[PDB]
Design an enzyme around this catalytic site. Sequence first.
Site, mmCIF file in Angstrom:
data_model
loop_
_atom_site.group_PDB
_atom_site.id
_atom_site.type_symbol
_atom_site.label_atom_id
_atom_site.label_comp_id
_atom_site.label_asym_id
_atom_site.label_seq_id
_atom_site.Cartn_x
_atom_site.Cartn_y
_atom_site.Cartn_z
ATOM 1 N N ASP A 138 31.068 41.857 37.420
ATOM 2 C CA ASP A 138 31.880 41.362 37.603
ATOM 3 C C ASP A 138 32.674 41.398 35.925
ATOM 4 O OD1 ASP A 138 33.380 40.981 40.272
ATOM 5 O OD2 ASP A 138 33.370 39.088 38.581
ATOM 6 N N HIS A 188 36.090 34.630 38.822
ATOM 7 C CA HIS A 188 35.796 35.593 39.962
ATOM 8 C C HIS A 188 34.724 35.794 39.951
ATOM 9 C CE1 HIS A 188 35.867 40.217 41.403
ATOM 10 N NE2 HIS A 188 36.707 39.316 42.559
ATOM 11 N N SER A 233 36.148 41.241 47.659
ATOM 12 C CA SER A 233 34.829 40.771 46.433
ATOM 13 C C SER A 233 33.973 39.952 47.491
ATOM 14 C CB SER A 233 35.446 40.182 45.717
ATOM 15 O OG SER A 233 35.744 39.523 45.790
#
EC number: 3.4.21.-
Lengths: 287, 92
Positions: free
Chosen positions: A27, A67, A227
């Site tokens: 990520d 994120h 996700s």
Amino acid sequence: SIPWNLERITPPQPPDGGSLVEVYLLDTSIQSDHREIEGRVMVTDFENVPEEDGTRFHRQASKCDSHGTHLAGVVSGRDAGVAKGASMRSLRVLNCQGKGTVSGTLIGLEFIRKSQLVQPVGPLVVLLPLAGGYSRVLNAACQRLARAGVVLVTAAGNFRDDACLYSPASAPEVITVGATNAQDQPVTLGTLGTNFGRCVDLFAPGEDIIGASSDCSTCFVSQSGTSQAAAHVAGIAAMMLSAEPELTLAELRQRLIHFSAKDVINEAWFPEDQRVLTPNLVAALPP
Amino acid sequence: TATFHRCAKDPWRLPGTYVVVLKEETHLSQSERTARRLQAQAARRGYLTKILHVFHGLLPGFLVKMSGDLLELALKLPHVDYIEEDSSVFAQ
């Protein structure tokens, strides 16, 4: 009270679940110092990212890490994580704007395999909370890693489209996860929303998910997407594999289907032809 | 029978960087030979190339930064299975 998602994946809280499993996160950069994931995530030396788009981009650590830090917390977070005992290792394949490349993702998938051969531990779970268009090379690399004994989990995609036109969501040997909300309905994200179709394996909570925020070392923020749903499944798979380590990939996929809630999604949200093709399953842990 | 592939979502395409994938049991020594073969063949025709990485462990092959003009020639190299143009992936 507890977060809606942790209540939903509980059959009607394990403090060191998934301890035998190591989860690889491909990520953005991560806030490794955040009290929610501190000591649980190992930041590898891996970085393969494209340059940020724009005239002058400001690389702010709080925004760059957002994120990834949240996803690492959904998987193994001290307070709000699914598998509180799991070990994580993160590779940076997404830049500060959330963009990466197929080549960067392949170099990352290869690095995981080389790390396993040099220093083997228990079962590995690879979380890919990313998507591009259908890729013959990305599906082939995913298939190879799954055939080598590694479990792979990907987001279905947030395009309200057929997940077979997206990679690695279309790779069949990967567990592809769509997202559902607090009412067990498919998640809508702006004018788009969760992906669907024959390439999705099951759904999991992916709306208003409380996780680690990189705005401060102890902050929490709610996030939404496939996700976030994929992170729930990587945690659930780590608890199932930790409790039954001899499970093969196929045996793991049947456990996920068996313990899922069935027929709680209203198929009328997906286009008419996708209703029979979309599995009506919402991920849950076994007793 | 070697083939070329590129992203169907045109704004997600990343032209100029290609993944050259080789046949299933190609050894690292041969992937390295093939990338050098691509470089010598491209140099002969006046094209600069850069081998960014050589893959092994999962898929045999290499990442190359080069002109797309070289793809007809790159597909004829020994041991080539297929070539795919690089493309974008996004946080979900």
